[PDB]
Amino acid sequence: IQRTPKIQVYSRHPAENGKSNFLNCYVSGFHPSDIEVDLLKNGERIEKVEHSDLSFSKDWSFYLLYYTEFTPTEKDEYACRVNHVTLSQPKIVKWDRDM
Template sequence: MAKAKEVALWCVLVAFCIYTVKTEKRTPSVQVFTRYPVEFGKENILQCYVDGFHPPKISVTLLKNGKKMDCQQSDLSFHSNWAFFQLFHANVTIDEKDEYAFRVEHETFSEPKIFKLEVY
């Protein structure tokens, strides 16, 4: 009986170690871009690709001139190393006076970070 308890404890310890290694925290990399080259006054698709983060809980908000806008999102997916990725997107008509950005909240950030669309 004591041997079975010892084996069970070792199994729990090994499982915990594997879980800990696979779940190290990773900071997301964020890219903001449009589907097509920007032409002011023409409809485009604004995209935010968030990659390489763990844990999977993340909040991404689209902002137009600092105000929240609706956007779509892909399913949450992961790489073989358990780093997650997700795409957020919205149809927009870009005006040269408007500022588009995505606010990203993740536990690896001390506060939400803003990633702006850079139009050249």
């Protein structure tokens, strides 16, 4: 009937401060397919974030990858914010370079 998204936030390559990389937010396991995903830099929405073409796993649950270029630093906080019909409020998952 409804399935809430799983959320992972991570980098394409291993994080090195001052080196250009991609910040990923992978949303999966959700149903129905409408979902709103923002990537955040110090709490502010990053513009022009791209995403993959809607697809789903063999259990019918949807998945999308949202991604953007980013140059991590010690200072800057990154996160992914997700809303779905299953969520009363947007869910924020912070980027941790160890997850």
